[PDB]
Nucleic acid binder design. Structure first.
Lengths: 241, 107
DNA sequence: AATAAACAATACATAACAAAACATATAAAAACCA
DNA sequence: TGGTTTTTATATGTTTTGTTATGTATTGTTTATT
C-alpha cells in the first residue's frame, strides 16, 4: 500500500484548469505513522534521489530596497513547485508553521500579509511527511485520532494516511532478517538481475513518458461504485483524494 | 512486565551485524566468523543483565514422558521402554526401581 | 512577521481520598391478631 | 394478656462520583536578530 501510494504519488495524476478562474491538480499529500525503526527515512531519502526538485525539511516575499521591488527568496516547498517535498518529524513541528501547510494541503497557495507585502502566490507540489505516535509508538487501547496527537481538521484534509505499524510476530520478521542477511551471504550483489525487477533508468523513462503523454478523463460510467465507496466512510476531501 | 524495557527492532539486528563487522575488523579478517555474533549477543545481553544485581530417575522420567507424549498409554506391559532403557546407557535395576516408584506414584 | 532562547507562570494527569448513593443484617420496638 | 409479625434503629459493606494536591509538561513573555 505504501509503495503503491508513493508510486502513484510520483505518477501524479491529471492537472486540469479553466480558461480564467479555475484550476485543479491531480495530487496526493501523504502522511506516515506507526511503529519506528523501519524503512521510513530510507523512503524519505530515496524519493529525494528520484525527483529533480525537492527539499529535505515555505518561502517568503521581500521588498528589496536596492531595486525597490518585491522579490521572493526561498527554498523548501517554494523551490519544489514541481515534484515532491519531504518532511520528517511532523509531530515535533511547531504550530505556527502548520498554518502554511494548512493552505498547501488542497489550495496550493501562499498568502503573505505582512509589512510591505500582501500577496497570494503559486506553491503546489506534494508533501511526503513521516510522523510518530507521540510517545506511544501506537497503542491498541487508544483510538487512531488521539494516538498521533494530530488535529482532525488538518488530517481529514490529508489525502492519504499510512499505518506503517509493525505488530511483531513469527514467520514474518524471520524473513525480514533472512532478506537482510541474504546480501551479506555474498560480498557483492551481482546476482540482483535474475528477478522480476525493472531497472531505474527504464522506470524513470516510462514514468516521464506517462506523465507527459496521458491526459485521462474520469467518465460517468464509474459513478455508481464511487457513491457507495463514499457512503462507507460516511456511515469531500476523501472524494477529492 | 515489571522488569521489561523496549522490544526487538531490526535496527538492533543491524547494530548486531555492525558490531560483528567491527569485531571482524579488529581481528583484521576478510570474513565474519561465528565467534563475533556470540560475543556481540553476550555483550548486548550483559549490557542489561546488571539490573538483577544428577538426574538418576529424572532422565527415565523424561523418556517415559516422551513416550507418554507420543501415544499416552499407561500399560502394564513394557516392551519399548525397556529397550530404550537398555540402549540409553544405564542398568535395569534402576529401571525396575523407577517402575516401582512411579507405579507407587500411579503414573 | 518570524526565529530563537532563557525564564516564569499556568495547566494537566493522576494519586489519594471523601462522601453520597446503593445495599444488607439483626436486635429492639411496635403494632397486631387472638 | 400473649404470641407473632412487621417496622425501625443501629451497624456495617459496596460502588460510583467528585475534590484536591502535586510533580512534571506546556505555554506565555520578553529581548535580540533576521
Amino acid at each position: 500500500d505504501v509503495k503503491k501510494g508513493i508510486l502513484l504519488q510520483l505518477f501524479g495524476g491529471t492537472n486540469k484548469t479553466f480558461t480564467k478562474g479555475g484550476r485543479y491538480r491531480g495530487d496526493i499529500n501523504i502522511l506516515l505513522c506507526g511503529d519506528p525503526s523501519t524503512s521510513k527515512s530510507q523512503i524519505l531519502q530515496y524519493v529525494h534521489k528520484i525527483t529533480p526538485r525537492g527539499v529535505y525539511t515555505t518561502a517568503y516575499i521581500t521588498r528589496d530596497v536596492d531595486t525597490k521591488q518585491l522579490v521572493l527568496e526561498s527554498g523548501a516547498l517554494v523551490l519544489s513547485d514541481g515534484g515532491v517535498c519531504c518532511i520528517d518529524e511532523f509531530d515535533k513541528m511547531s504550530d505556527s508553521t502548520r498554518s502554511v501547510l494548512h493552505e498547501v494541503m488542497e489550495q496550493q497557495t501562499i498568502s503573505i500579509a505582512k509589512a510591505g507585502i500582501i500577496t497570494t502566490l503559486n506553491a503546489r507540489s506534494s508533501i511526503l511527511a513521516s510522523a510518530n505516535p507521540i510517545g506511544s509508538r501506537y497503542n491498541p487501547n487508544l483510538p487512531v485520532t488521539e494516538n498521533i496527537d494530530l488535529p482532525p481538521p488538518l488530517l481529514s484534509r490529508f489525502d492519504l494516511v499510512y499505518l506503517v505499524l509493525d505488530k511483531v510476530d513469527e514467520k514474518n520478521d524471520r524473513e525480514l532478517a533472512k532478506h537482510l542477511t541474504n546480501l551479506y551471504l555474498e560480498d557483492k550483489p551481482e546476482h540482483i538481475s535474475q528477478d522480476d525487477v525493472l531497472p531505474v533508468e527504464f522506470l524513470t523513462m516510462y514514468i516521464s513518458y506517462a506523465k507527459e503523454h496521458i491526459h485521462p478523463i474520469i467518465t460517468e460510467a464509474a459513478k455508481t461504485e464511487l457513491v457507495r465507496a463514499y457512503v462507507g466512510m460516511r456511515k469531500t476531501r476523501q472524494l477529492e483524494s | 512486565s515489571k522488569f521489561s524495557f523496549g522490544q526487538a527492532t531490526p535496527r538492533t539486528l543491524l547494530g548486531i551485524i555492525r558490531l560483528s563487522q567491527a569485531l571482524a575488523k579488529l581481528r583484521l579478517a576478510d570474513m565474519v566468523d561465528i565467534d563475533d555474533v556470540e560475543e556481540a549477543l553476550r555483550l548486548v545481553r550483559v549490557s542489561k543483565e546488571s539490573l538483577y544485581q544428577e538426574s538418576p530417575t529424572t532422565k527415565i522420567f523424561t523418556i517415559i514422558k516422551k513416550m507418554l507424549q507420543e501415544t499416552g498409554k499407561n500399560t502394564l506391559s513394557y516392551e519399548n521402554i525397556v529397550k530404550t532403557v537398555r540402549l540409553r546407557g544405564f542398568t535395569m535395576l534402576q529401571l525396575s526401581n523407577c517402575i516401582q516408584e512411579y507405579s507407587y506414584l500411579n503414573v
